[PDB]
Specification:
This is part of a larger assembly, with three copies of chain A, two copies of chain B and one copy of chain C. Chain A is an alpha/beta fold. Helix content of chain A is 30%, strand content 13%. Chain A contains ten helices and twelve strands. The longest helix of chain A has 19 residues. The two termini of chain A are 26 Å apart. In chain A, 44% of the residues are buried. Chain B is an alpha+beta fold. In chain B, strand 4 and strand 5 form a beta hairpin. Chain C is 5% helix and 34% strand. Classes of the chains: A alpha/beta, B alpha+beta, C mainly beta. At the B-D interface, helix 1 and strand 6 of B face strand 2, strand 4 and strand 7 of D. Strand 12 of chain A pairs parallel with strand 11 of chain E. Chain C: It comes from Streptomyces coelicolor (strain ATCC BAA-471 / A3(2) / M145).
Chain lengths: 352, 149, 140, 149, 359, 359
């Protein structure tokens, strides 16, 4: 599918600092093992595979039973200045939609990574994610905050304010058939799976929030609606249980302060639009710019958009307010012809 | 367009489709934008059978526009297109298409943007042993959505 | 989307397992019904209550060209006296790519009728024996 | 292929059927890569009846070629072929065939392989006592699967 | 009759280094070994026939399955030992030197002596004009190393050469195991397909590299942006499609000949004219002979403009031919007639920009 | 090659007053600002491109985001600073001075100095004929105020003027808020579309004013009946349809040239002839030369009559061409040939009346 996850962190070392592909949980076990050492990667992956999910890229930076910092441990990796190994190595994949760093937060509750490093590492993820322009970041929250700590923490300690990050406040308590025990797992991978299932059926077209988190058992806190409208406007999302519906995910708001892109549905949509256009638009080193290119591009893109509007994923009574594609002399003057042509397009999306 | 009474000429066809084109293209002889009608024999009150009320229908496609690539040269590009649709592989057979029209001087003016090309028919000319004309590898292209513009 | 993967009614795959019946050529009538019971409330004009009651699977007619392997079918049908066997069938619809669009598997089959060929000196066609099939449920 | 657009002048046929050949074979009629369409009328939630979908179908085949062997000489292979199919004996009547198209200079460039030939028709020309234009022993050849290449 | 390549390397059996060959693939195994040993020549010529195109010239060198250095690659007037013996045939349209760096891998060659062959080969290729040199970079390098290596160590800055940075993990059916080979053979195959499919004019990029199963070092849009201005092509894998050659640029610093196809296309013009103006016997040493020279050149060019490879709304701005007295002085010396030519090449784009919005 | 328009105003960045530019909308932002400040120039030309037409000549004026008064808008022989520099271009077919009255709104200009620019523009426009001047009235005026202002204070009574009374509540995407702008830019767009769609002979009225979301003051049939006889156009909204320009008259008191299109159409005829009779080098200073100038004019006009834009059941009673010896007497001077011309214009309507009864 076009929903491909990729998250990194500690695990029984296999291919250290090399993004490898796992398509079934029976393949993931055949590369690291099973939940040994208490590392959170297995729980995040197993929840991802159990709760929807098609494929994932994993980097086993850590090792099964020395040091934790921004470089080593469950954190970033700039590729040893080569930017083709580890965290930076993911830039050599261009086939991702969402990225998590689940096992980073073991270090906070197991070692001495402290809190300032977490702010630095996750910000490194956001800048990397924003740089690629197609991967949104799923950011894990601090553990065991009750109601007001995380509201202050997000708005005062590590205020991110990015267009490619989404939060999920309460953790999830997940049990394992192998170990018969329930461990408080970070709320990612479980949700990352929800995105995979959502887009495939409901349509990417809709923010994959309102769904049941399969694989869950309970939550650390039951976030009542009294503070819900106290927490949604600041951008955080809350996974709250319900009387007879399960452990459903509430919240489709990103971390951006910009009102235009505040909705998670809109931002995930444009990443799918851009990615499909990138595959659609080819012959980069085709031939000559001429005139044929301007009309050929204009027709091909519009043909893809008009079909999209027919599926209802675009707002508009008639396929005119849906989009506006222009590739003419009023976009590519002869100056830009000497280098490379351009084009413009628009899509309008709803949310509720 | 240079004069105040242009009307185009038959000698200005060309087309860019994602499958490779050819040098000389003798013909393309069907281009329809058909929509059908109804019949309602509506009655008012005083007694007349009423006007023949007519309404609006689908823009029925299937306007395959037969194309004539004059000369079955060694270029087997057309017969590779059909040989895909026969076995399926619709990912590469459902090709977008275009038709370009140029002026008394060769410059595009109007383009018949197609929406789904299929190439559902390849027919060769008679192999008469003694005639004079060339060999015509006539192609019939079918649509899913009618032409645009 | 990939321009969708629409259904079709030419490409398929029809097979019966068990006895060497092999692969058939044409299905018909594959259907599931329920038997609603209509109880009409006396004091409330306007509708009749609809209450579900059981489900029921209808028969299936399978046809194929009359090949010399039709002796197996007659052997299967005439095995009722000495003991019959219910193999597991399949009815799958495909697109021309050979991929799968929907696969139904009959849980347990049982012959019902076998309308043999209709020989006719003047009609240009090919003999199509018809093997009706009883049903026990869909598989999953 | 000598030039950019020399095409294929129609005076270059020859068959390759397993039965014995013929000196003249002075015609070869229509050959097709026939395959028609289907029709779905799907409408989206918006309300439009939508573009009529067009899916696929089998390659219809049954292509009939009216090979015209100008002149019924003593060569009775054509009438031995059909007379063979009248009684049966597929061992000798189901012979695959090939139609060869030759270059501007007499060299083969493209071949239309036929998967199964049948020879279901042989028709003689009219015999007008006082006319001209010789006798034509026109043959119609049927297929099982369509041509290839 | 088409693009004719030219390779050198060690081959197990067959003719020695002195002659040159015109083999196809199965003729090659009947005349040379089949992947035996870690010799990259066999790998390169296999993909060349696998990636379309024919007429490959193979030249044996020292070792024959050695320590060549510069000794076993140039012979000059001896007409043997590599490039010196390649001047004897004008059919060559491009050259490549694979398996040279296989010697460097095993050692006994030294990196500083590697540039001796390349620079000598480029000087040889640049000597006779109708030839494009292909170079391959040392394996086991990152983004920084290749930029450092190209600009400060081997800054050729020649007009007849192209560079393709990342190597290729090809296949060796002899042992059933993959191998890292230079891409000179497989790149040379693309230039044959491109020229024969859509015309030589179109720059040979964005064409699927057949036979290659995996690459060596993936290139990102964040790092190719440094390499392209200094002029080195890149090979990268595009998920959703195959492995395709990017860039298609030359190494010269001249802004006139930055794009690769212009050099390739102008070579096509030079070869076409040469076989059409063969009056070198100088029998009609006459001033009216220029009528045929001017006619037989413009008539050919205007046919190419009907194709549309050149640029210009009319043949007036498409080219500019002139071979009359203005360019032909008295010249009592038998110095041949002088012809003036130009073909306005098409400037190809390589940047795609799309402006989103949400109204 | 169409209704080329001229504009004057202050724009933040770009060339200074000295040159006069040719522009399309994306060139505008690449050459000047994007609605920055309350400068009405940017609003005026945005609708001009939005309401059809191209080839807009903008003139930067001092202040560039000033107190222009009557000085910054006139340059005379300096070929700079506004109308003085506009004489250098003959392609212009219309002129407009938006954002002039923005200065009055901000103050430091005074109303009595406003008439200096417009009257100077009228003299400049009349200085070479082939252009029509567009004027705009002071904002926030009522029906009584505009009639007094036009007749008592600014009784121009010129033949090359057009006045459009109510302003427009246009849009400014830069701030996300609407704004009141003079309608000179949007009206100038209509004259481009009209001629380019139905022919220039049809008077530019009853065409939808694109881009305008709301008006300023509605005009009723009870008050336009005062304004129309004294020659001022009106913009009003028609429920059930869009906002359309009404009237399309001129400010001259001459009954001959009351209707606007006749002045517009006669400009089209005069401009067309000038392109077709360029023999000014006076080489064939001959009496038989003017035979051609009579042929090349009547041949063009008779084509216009076939278009049906000239009244008359035949080519006769339609035009009037005469270039014989009587109109070219032997002056023996090189004053040049003399052409007698007329084109019988179509008597345009303005009123609709319908009678009713109940039998």
């Amino acid at each position: 599918g076009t929903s491909v996850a990729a998250f990194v962190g500690l695990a029984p070392t296999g291919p250290l600092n090399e993004p490898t592909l796992v398509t079934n949980w029976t393949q993931y076990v055949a590369a690291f093992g099973d939940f040994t050492g208490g590392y959170y990667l297995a729980h995040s992956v197993y929840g991802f595979f159990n709760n929807g999910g098609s494929a994932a890229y994993v980097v086993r930076v850590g090792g099964s039973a020395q040091a934790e910092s921004a470089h080593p441990g469950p954190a970033q990796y700039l590729g040893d200045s080569s930017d083709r190994t580890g965290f930076g190595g993911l830039e050599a994949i261009d086939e991702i939609s969402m990225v998590a760093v689940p096992d980073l937060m073991a270090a906070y509750q197991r070692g001495a990574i402290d809190l300032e490093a977490v702010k630095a590492v996750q910000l490194g993820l956001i800048a990397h994610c924003e740089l690629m322009g197609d991967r949104v970041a799923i950011i894990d929250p601090p553990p065991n905050q009750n109601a007001r700590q995380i509201r202050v923490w997000r708005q005062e300690t590590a205020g991110y304010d990015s267009k490619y990050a989404a939060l999920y406040y309460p953790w999830i308590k997940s049990f394992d058939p192998a170990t018969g025990q329930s461990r408080l797992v970070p709320p990612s991978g479980h949700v990352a799976g929800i995105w995979a299932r959502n887009d495939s059926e409901r349509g990417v077209h809709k923010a994959p929030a309102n769904e049941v988190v399969r694989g869950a058992v309970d939550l650390e806190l039951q976030i009542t609606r009294g503070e819900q409208d106290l927490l949604n406007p600041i951008g955080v999302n809350c996974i709250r249980s319900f009387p007879g519906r399960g452990i459903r995910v509430w919240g489709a708001r990103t971390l951006s302060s910009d009102p235009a892109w505040r909705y998670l549905n809109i931002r995930r949509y444009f990443n799918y639009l851009e990615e499909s256009i990138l595959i659609g638009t080819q012959w980069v080193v085709f031939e000559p710019n001429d005139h044929n290119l301007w009309a050929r591009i204009r027709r091909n893109v519009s043909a893809f958009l008009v079909n999209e509007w027919r599926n209802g994923a675009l707002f508009g009574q008639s396929p005119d307010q849906a989009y506006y594609v222009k590739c003419d002399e009023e976009t590519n003057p002869p100056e830009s012809v000497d280098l490379g042509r351009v084009v413009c397009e628009i899509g309008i999306a709803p949310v509720k | 367009m240079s004069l105040p009474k242009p009307e185009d000429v038959l000698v200005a066809p060309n087309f860019g489709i994602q499958i490779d084109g050819v040098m000389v293209e003798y013909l393309n002889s069907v281009s329809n934008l058909q929509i059908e009608q109804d019949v309602i024999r509506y009655q008012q009150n005083q007694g007349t059978t009423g006007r023949n009320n007519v309404t609006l229908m689908p823009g029925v496609a299937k306007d395959g526009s037969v194309q004539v690539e004059r000369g079955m040269s060694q270029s087997s590009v057309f017969t590779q297109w059909i040989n895909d649709s026969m076995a399926g592989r619709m990912a590469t057979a459902r090709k977008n298409a275009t038709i370009i029209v140029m002026d008394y001087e060769d410059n595009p003016v109007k383009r018949w943007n197609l929406r789904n090309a299929w190439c559902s028919k390849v027919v060769a000319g008679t192999l008469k042993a003694g005639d004079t004309n060339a060999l015509t590898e006539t192609i019939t292209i079918v649509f899913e959505e009618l032409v645009v513009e | 989307m990939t321009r969708k993967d629409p259904g079709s009614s030419i490409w398929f795959s029809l097979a019966i397992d068990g006895e060497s019946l092999g692969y058939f050529n044409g299905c018909e009538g594959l259907s599931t019904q329920v038997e609603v019971e209509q109880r009409q409330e006396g004091g409330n004009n306007g509708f009749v209550w609809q209450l579900p009651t059981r489900v029921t699977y209808s028969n299936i007619r399978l046809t194929r060209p009359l090949t010399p392997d039709t002796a197996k079918v007659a052997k299967w049908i005439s095995s009722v006296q000495t003991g019959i066997q219910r193999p597991t069938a399949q009815i799958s619809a495909l697109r021309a790519d050979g991929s799968l669009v929907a696969r139904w598997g009959l849980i347990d089959v049982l012959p019902v009728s076998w309308q043999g060929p209709s020989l006719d000196p003047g009609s240009a066609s090919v003999a199509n024996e018809v093997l009706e099939i009883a049903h026990h449920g869909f598989t999953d």
